[PDB]
């Protein structure tokens, strides 16, 4: 059985544009080092971004800000003015992670964590189990401010973050994290694939119309308008046949699974999670910020107690709503 | 309706022996100031205790260490060697709050908070709703190392702390905290009274025999042996007739309500909690560390979701235990 | 583990056929052979067939009316609501009048449409385990006979008056039936100590219990309602009332021939039913029972699978509670 | 809101009395008046009384055996387990033999002891709302008549063969009954759109559904089991199977006179029952229903009080789940 983090602190474990740039290069190595030195508990170090960078930020912050009220989903359009008014979300200044993290935490409890560059799906997903998002502090090269070969502070901030501010989305994400914990490769890859057609390139239901909630969609200008058109062949979010689906990395996907809601996708996920054959069950304890392995009979005595009291609340509340 | 904290950070709101001592006096004012300056989030400041103090600590740490395996309850005798081996619980050194707090947090999530001196039952109990204990950093005067007119670092550390390390006890305490939130004076006082015959001077059930789990009992040498004898008239922990019970402050209580268990007392407490007439219901969110007022229909949609997923875990787990 | 009925028809073992001077009428050769006549009816009664009717005698019909009159006055006064509500329906339907003794087949047939409780003629008396066992099927073991006319204000044991003007009216109430049944399902295979404990509870509840009707207290106990002297006594300020707390109620020791100073006050029958549901879980049983009203059959579960069963049940109910919330905005 | 039966006896409104050339036997004056004979039985049938028996004719008994023989061979092969299990009991008990047509009173009386499902003779056909409504009481509206002997391998509608050698065996299974009943409780007062949706589900499940038996697939559909030609067709690799997903199954449009390329594969009846429980919550109803097998009565709840009811139910079950854990160490 694959190894997985039990504690939150246990997470401590040329075609590229700008490859010829000695500065940007050493700059991106500067950011990575920050990551390698970052240990949970301490505030995310702040950085003094450069204009050549701040320009690229505003070039994307302007190009996308127009298509959000249009193509972006509600939960996005709702939180944005709060992100702008609070975490310094403006085309003239790049938002500081410590702020966004500190912010997201009060919304859902999701904290940010600076990742060197990239990491396994098992590792990425594992962070979600603790409502921890591994974010990139760096930024794409100014050469092509409309394209990134991988996640940059724009994709993470103007794509992922706004969704992680939504109550229903967080639990949903966390589910996948709890699922991936100790899951066999085949399923790990399957979840990643789901994570794609959902978190990265997913489309939600807003009444009759369809909106874009995918992080890869929201941060990408060209696909934001493409996924909303009548060119791609939409399908229902069915985790069963969605995990099998093969996709391209460098280009647009003709398939975009339409989820009813995050609260709803959550259930097919839990299902896909129940599908995950694990020799046990795990539960996250937000108080001890530990991961509880449910295998013992006394381990269940306490989860039972947790629920028992919580419903007792749900009842008393309900009893008072005549 | 009385005002109560919604956020954890909202908690930011001559007969005495040593009264003639100008030093100890200004010393205890030194400790209090620490409290007044302490704001949530920052580590509890450490202090260099004096020998005249360290002597009094060891005089109590020795006198009581003998009667614990005897009169103290199991959960106490179990955690002690861990407190001694970890938070520096030795007669030669006074334990630092930042350590104990940091410790207790990993056990149940209970964090310590330095309180100036004393505070209302409503305020004290209110802290419990966030699994926050208001502790005294100071110590009794060396004149009479076997008596304290109020809580000192000995009563809090060698009386309360060990119980707050127990999983079942924490939820129990928290219940009272959640109960007291916005509760009318009459009930606030009633809860305090319960808190007494339970947390302060309560006796538990350990098979057939009776043990002492009360904080006031464990920190007090004279009553530790008295409550265990056949002189007081024991009664069952019945929150209904326990809240009415009137008690003395300066002396021993002939009445000591015997609770089956903390997991058990918890239910009569919840009951006594259900007795508390509040125009609503509140729920604590460990992720956003906020206090949720359940009054809206959408407020329940989410609590329902929390439970739904948690049982789904309880089921999957159970399903795997044939 | 004691033997218990799995099917409703298995109660035919209680009244198989095979297997006291101080009593008023002991010297009466007629009443004697009369009460043996009634018992025989019981021994011959098998589930499924209608309860045989009987032509009661005047010496009996007089005793019936002597009790039907003495108590009819104190019911709207001391008796509980659920009683005062159903009575006019019992009177208007099952022939509840001081001039005629009600026929069991009628009462049974009646009670069945109200809650599903059917009556069953019992020879005389039976173990608490056997009695309670019938409740698990919503079956009440009733006496077809009647006390001796010598003392029409006293009975040393259950007679058609105690059963009809005491138990029956309560078994017509929806909440009370499930409650009773709980005890029945509890007693199924329960160890003696707990069987006796339940009986004791059954007493301070079904037999001599007092309920809550707003602020005041009413009598709902079957032994109270059928007894004139205690009906007015339990309602006075002489006995020391206590709360219905099954924990310390089962320990309580009581007298059989006289009045009890203790009368546990239950909030409601709906309230107590729960106090019994859990108490059952607190009962040492290498299994768990489950009644199926569709097949009138009891199912015996293994604590482990019983565990799993609860899990699924909860997991289900909650999701629906989730969906319910969604549409209600 | 459409009218629905509150009591089991209220189904007497379905077969009140008041309120096609292509058919084989349309030109037959005897068979015609014979089938009108059967219908009249229905119109005169009131709940509670035993289903009248009939002396079937040889021209009929031949058609019965022609179907009882043709299908008896493909059951152990294509039919589902629950079917192959109960059959020898149906044969050994309700007179299921090619030489004699089984009497409804027997089958009904039988099914009742298995799950509680009672049969009810229906004139001919009835609305989906009415049909489903019977299921809420575990009551099946069955046809007493039989197809015309001209074509003993085809019926334009349900006949005593389809009902007995197709539906009945499934209604003998514990899990299937509750499942069916769910739909019945669902349809109670449900708006047309959903009524039709349920019917459609009822089709791809009860009528033409396929279950899961390990790795292989078996036929449990009533329309499949009674039809020889489709029994072997649904089991082959010609139709495009899909998972039982009530969401996209209700939308699915099907043909009436011919074979369906789609046959939704359900894991189990116990599995589907849930897919129906929740689907009911997802149904727009200014109320919620609740069946009481003890009084054979439906109770209509107000979403709000229904909410509260769920809360208490959950809150209760969990505490017991708590106590259960304690004793099991
Ligand atoms: Fe991403
Ligand atoms: Fe204290
Ligand atoms: Fe009695
Ligand atoms: Fe059919």
Curated annotation (Swiss-Prot), chains C, D:
EC number: 1.14.16.1
EC top class named in words: oxidoreductase
Outcome after substituting residue 153 to I: In PAH deficiency; severe; uncertain significance
One Gene Ontology molecular-function label: phenylalanine 4-monooxygenase activity
Temperature remarks: Optimum temperature is 50 degrees Celsius.
Effect ascribed to mutating residue 98 to G: In PAH deficiency; severe
Record protein name field: Phenylalanine-4-hydroxylase
Effect after changing residue 78 to R: In PAH deficiency; severe
Effect of residue 188 to P: In PAH deficiency; severe
Outcome after substituting residue 174 to H: In PAH deficiency; severe
Stated consequence of mutating residue 221 to R: In PAH deficiency; severe; uncertain significance
Phenotypic consequence of residue 54 to L: In PAH deficiency; severe
Shown segment, full-protein numbering: 118 to 452 of 452
Effect of residue 28 to H: In PAH deficiency; severe
Mutation effect (residue 47 to R): In PAH deficiency; severe
A biological process from GO: amino acid biosynthetic process
Effect of residue 48 to A: In PAH deficiency; severe
Effect annotated for changing residue 73 to Y: In PAH deficiency; mild
Variant or mutagenesis effect after changing residue 272 to G: In PAH deficiency; severe
Effect of residue 227 to T: In PAH deficiency; severe
Consequence of substituting residue 50 to T: In PAH deficiency; severe
Cystine connections: none
């Amino acid at each position: 059985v694959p190894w997985f983090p039990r504690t939150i602190q246990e997470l401590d474990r040329a075609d590229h544009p700008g490859f010829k740039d000695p500065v940007y290069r050493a700059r991106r190595k500067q950011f990575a080092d920050i990551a390698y030195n970052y240990r949970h508990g301490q505030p995310i170090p702040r950085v003094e971004y450069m204009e050549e960078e701040k320009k690229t930020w505003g070039t994307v912050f302007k190009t996308l800000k127009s298509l959000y009220k249009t193509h972006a989903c509600y939960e996005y359009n709702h939180i944005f003015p709060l992100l702008e008014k609070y975490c310094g979300f403006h085309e003239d200044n790049i938002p500081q992670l410590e702020d966004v993290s500190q912010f997201l935490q009060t919304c859902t409890g999701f904290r940010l964590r600076p990742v060197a560059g990239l990491l396994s799906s098992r590792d990425f997903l594992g962070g979600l189990a603790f409502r921890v998002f591994h974010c990139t502090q760096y930024i794409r090269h100014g050469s092509k401010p409309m394209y990134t070969p991988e996640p940059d502070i724009c994709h993470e901030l103007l794509g992922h973050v706004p969704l992680f501010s939504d109550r229903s989305f967080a639990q949903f994400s966390q589910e996948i994290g709890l699922a991936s914990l100790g899951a066999p490769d085949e399923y790990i890859e399957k979840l990643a694939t789901i994570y794609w057609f959902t978190v990265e390139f997913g489309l939600c239901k807003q009444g009759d119309s369809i909106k874009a909630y995918g992080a890869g969609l929201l941060s990408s200008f060209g696909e934001l308008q493409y996924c909303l058109s009548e060119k791609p062949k939409l399908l229902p979010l069915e985790l069963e046949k969605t995990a099998i689906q093969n996709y391209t990395v460098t280009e647009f996907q003709p398939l975009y699974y339409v989820a009813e809601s995050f609260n709803d996708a959550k259930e097919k996920v839990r299902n896909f999670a129940a599908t995950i054959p694990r020799p046990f069950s795990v539960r996250y304890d937000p108080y001890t910020q530990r991961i509880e392995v449910l295998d013992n009979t006394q381990q269940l005595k306490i989860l039972a107690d947790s629920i028992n009291s919580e419903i007792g609340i749900l009842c008393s509340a309900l009893q008072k709503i005549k």
